Design a protein around this ligand. Structure first.
Ligand SMILES: Nc1ncnc2c1ncn2[C@@H]1O[C@H](COP(=O)(O)OP(=O)(O)OP(=O)(O)O)[C@@H](O)[C@H]1O
Ligand SMILES: [Fe+3]
Lengths: 336, 229
């Protein structure tokens, strides 16, 4: 089969076509990054407006790219949440009505299930069961995954998620929003150990996370130290290493608790080159395996929605004529 | 020709069908329900009309202004249908729609349309029907504070009819304007009143491909303050 997948949950418009035989037939993406960069965050109304300008043309360009016509599409999938109500509504109305007009089933997709499954799009997808690390802008969870929709929350952040933590310390360092990818690059020219940040919630057992203490620890360090590019880079690396090591330690503990030998890494922060190497090294020493998506599928993208749409269609999750979005949509609520 | 019209720019949901002059129309109030009602209603009106989506020659949609969220529901649902069924699209102003409704209901030909835009402001338009049934005044559409509407009405003369939630929120909008103001008995736009406008636009070749359909928000200063620098 073939599933058209539509992603507009936040600040990026994504359209893909997934073929369960041939693979990925189309991938289209428009990022609104420079729309919101002057505001220091995503302005909801400006996001909602640009999705209206991009959704349809990107859909046209995906069918055009793929050389496919409407009859070649067996289902239409769209992100129903979580995300900005305003953004999610663009993708879901176009999607629901496009499926109505094509007379094919419509498939509402959970955005985080999307990230979680994106690694299934590479060579050698992980088999169930696995531990999953979901590290994004607003979410940082450890999950025990035994199958589709069998997602048990092992751990989560009680305050800032890792991504926002990267974005907030990146801003203190004077970088564009979102600065997480830019702090990481800045940190590449940092001296290891020059500064030493805490690894939060690693002195007691447990699998929950806390990162808000790192912003303060970074801010305080930038304030008592030089402004030369090198010292800035030294703080950036101190911050990265701290986050990466915190996530690593937590992943270890979750693999220990569950007994699983497979670690799935997901969300925007999973693009982080330092965290990829580190997780990959740890699973070697454990005689197990790490899985993550190509960097482009870590951040928001339509391809993961065309895939998870495919998966949920096979699992019976079609929608009636109603359209509904869920800006807050707990992963725990997805049925099996 | 056949025309399908849908609208969700305000608290109402409506769909209407025109079949070479014979009209099928449905209207109801949908506060907080638009996405749960809109596609079921398109389906109702197709089936009860014995017409399929592929029979339709043009899709008309309420283009704005109104609720940003409602305006996008309308355009998004319409784009999907048109994309999906390969239909050309016709964007109809919600202010002009309510003016047509006034014309329909009591023969009004001079309409002051005001929508509650919230934030102390109203979406404003002065529409006037010519002998041939065409509405003039599309250039007058704006989002305005009550005091600037007052200044606008001072440049106007005569008798006008009033339509839209605007006057419902500001009943003394035209106080000391110098005009004779009559209630136009139209609170909200109805897809049925899109049809005749849609028809004339269709005749003169004013239909666009799905990718050209655009909302009209009027209020464009929607963002918080830029960062220092
Ligand atoms: N190379 C990188 N290093 C660190 N962080 C990164 C990197 N690349 C992306 N990110 C982070 O990824 C986030 C965006 O990814 P994603 O879309 O998963 O999160 P989100 O949409 O904010 O989260 P949620 O889905 O919980 O709302 C940003 O916080 C960004 O800083
Ligand atoms: Fe995301």
């Amino acid at each position: 089969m073939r599933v058209l997948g539509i992603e507009t949950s936040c600040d990026a418009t994504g359209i893909a076509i997934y073929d369960d035989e041939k693979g990925l037939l189309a991938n289209q993406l428009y990022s609104q990054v420079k729309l919101h960069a002057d505001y220091g965050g995503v302005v909801p109304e400006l996001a909602s407006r640009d999705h209206v300008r991009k959704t349809v043309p990107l859909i046209q360009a995906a069918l055009k790219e793929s050389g496919l016509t409407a009859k070649d599409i067996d289902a239409v999938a769209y992100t129903a949440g979580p995300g900005l109500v305003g953004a999610l509504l663009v993708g879901a109305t176009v999607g629901r009505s496009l499926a109505f007009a094509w007379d094919v089933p419509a498939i509402p997709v959970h955005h985080m299930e999307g990230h979680l499954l994106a690694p299934m799009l590479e060579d050698n997808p992980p088999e169930f069961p696995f531990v999953a690390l979901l590290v994004s802008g607003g979410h940082t969870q450890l999950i025990s995954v035994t199958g589709i929709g069998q997602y048990e929350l092992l751990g989560e952040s009680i305050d800032d998620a890792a991504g926002e933590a990267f974005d907030k310390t990146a801003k203190l360092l004077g970088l564009d929003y979102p600065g997480g990818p830019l702090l990481s690059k800045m940190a590449a020219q940092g001296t290891a150990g020059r500064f030493v940040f805490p690894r939060p919630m690693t002195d007691r057992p447990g699998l929950d996370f806390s990162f808000s203490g790192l912003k303060t620890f970074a801010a305080n360090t930038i304030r008592d130290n030089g402004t030369d590019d090198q010292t800035r880079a030294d703080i950036a690396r101190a911050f990265e290493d701290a986050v990466v090591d915190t996530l690593m330690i937590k992943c270890k503990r979750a693999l220990d608790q569950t007994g699983f030998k497979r670690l799935v890494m997901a969300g925007g922060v999973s693009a982080n080159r330092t965290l990829r190497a580190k997780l990959a090294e740890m699973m070697k020493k454990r005689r197990g395996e790490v899985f993550y998506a190509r960097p482009e599928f870590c951040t928001d993208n339509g391809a993961m929605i065309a895939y998870a749409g495919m998966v949920r269609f096979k699992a019976g999750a079609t929608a009636d004529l109603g359209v509904s979005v869920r800006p807050r949509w707990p992963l725990a609520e997805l049925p099996a | 020709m056949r025309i399908l019209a849908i609208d969700t720019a305000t608290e109402a949901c409506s769909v209407a069908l025109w079949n070479d002059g014979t009209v099928n129309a449905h209207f109801e109030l949908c506060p907080r329900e638009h996405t749960q009602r809109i596609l079921p209603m398109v389906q109702d009106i197709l089936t009860t009309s014995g017409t399929s989506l592929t029979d339709i020659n043009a899709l008309a949609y309420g283009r704005g202004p109104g609720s940003f969220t409602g305006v996008r529901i309308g355009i998004g649902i319409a784009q999907g249908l048109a994309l999906g069924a390969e239909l050309p699209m016709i964007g109809v102003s919600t202010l002009m729609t309510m003016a047509q409704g006034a014309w329909r209901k009591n023969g009004a030909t001079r309409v002051l349309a005001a929508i509650d835009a919230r934030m102390g402001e109203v979406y404003w338009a002065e529409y006037q029907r010519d002998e041939n049934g065409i509405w003039h005044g599309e250039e007058t559409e704006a989002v305005l504070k009550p005091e600037i509407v007052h200044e606008r009405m001072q440049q106007l003369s005569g008798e006008w009819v009033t339509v839209g939630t605007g006057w419902q929120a500001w009943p003394d909008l035209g106080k000391e304007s110098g005009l004779v103001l009559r209630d136009g008995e139209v609170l909200l736009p109805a897809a049925e009143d899109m049809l005749p406008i849609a028809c004339q636009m269709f005749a003169e070749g004013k239909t666009v491909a799905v990718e050209h359909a655009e909302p009209v928000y009027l209020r464009n200063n929607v963002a918080w303050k830029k960062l220092p620098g």
